[PDB]
């Protein structure tokens with residue numbers, strides 16, 4: 001019941017898109033390669049690629065990344081304790097003016113979850129938000145994360161327009177997942193997580209780029225459980241977002257969900273800006 005519409009590559013005022021950002025929870029950089037995730041990146045040819053759940057360090061990266069032309073500025077963050085879990089990457093054609101790691105809070109900065117890249121007219125944040133876990137074992141920690149992240153982004157957005165992208169591990173509203181009723185007590189659709197997302201949009205403020213453009217479009221998901229053939233059945237959740245400072249809405253051309261790109265239990269999302 002879902003086919004992503006064609007790429008809209010001009011802005012509301014007819015200006016051509018010039019900046020293409022792709023974000024993807026890859027479920028392990030090495031498995032993602034074995035599952036032919038990198039071939040797709042080459043076709044998409046984004047100016048900036050944000051990756052979540054790399055499960056990799058800046059110390060143990062695959063060598064294919066070094067030969068990706070068009071994405072030669074590469075920044076990585078992995079947990080401070082063990083390796084093989086979480087982790088994020090940000091790869092850019094253009095060198096950012098400044099790259100920083102984490103959200104300025106030691107409590108929340110030990111799991112390789114956030115990279116901040118400052119560009120000329122905007123700041124890009126990519127995030128892998130803590131999953132509330134099986135049995136919601138981490139829901140209280142996730143609530144702490146949500147507040148600290150919100151406060152961090154509010155301060156960031158006070159100085160420069162913000163693009164936040166990544167796996168935010170929440171389906172905001174019922175339209176954002178195939179089975180809302182059955183998941184209201186499962187990670188990603190608890191009232192606590194949904195309210196945190198709503199407060200994030202209102203507080204910073206940020207706009208949900210996809211839902212701004214497609215306010216009434218159902219069955220549009222970016223994650224499906226590996227099990228039970230969920231992806232072939234489109235039993236999914238929209239967990240991956242581009243959230244934009246409002247001043248970037250005149251530059252917004254499109255916000256895509258790359259449903260057919262394989263390699264992970266998430267699919268990529270792609271943003272087009274006329275910037």
Ligand SMILES: [Mg+2]
Pocket residue numbers: 027053
């Ligand atoms: Mg995973």
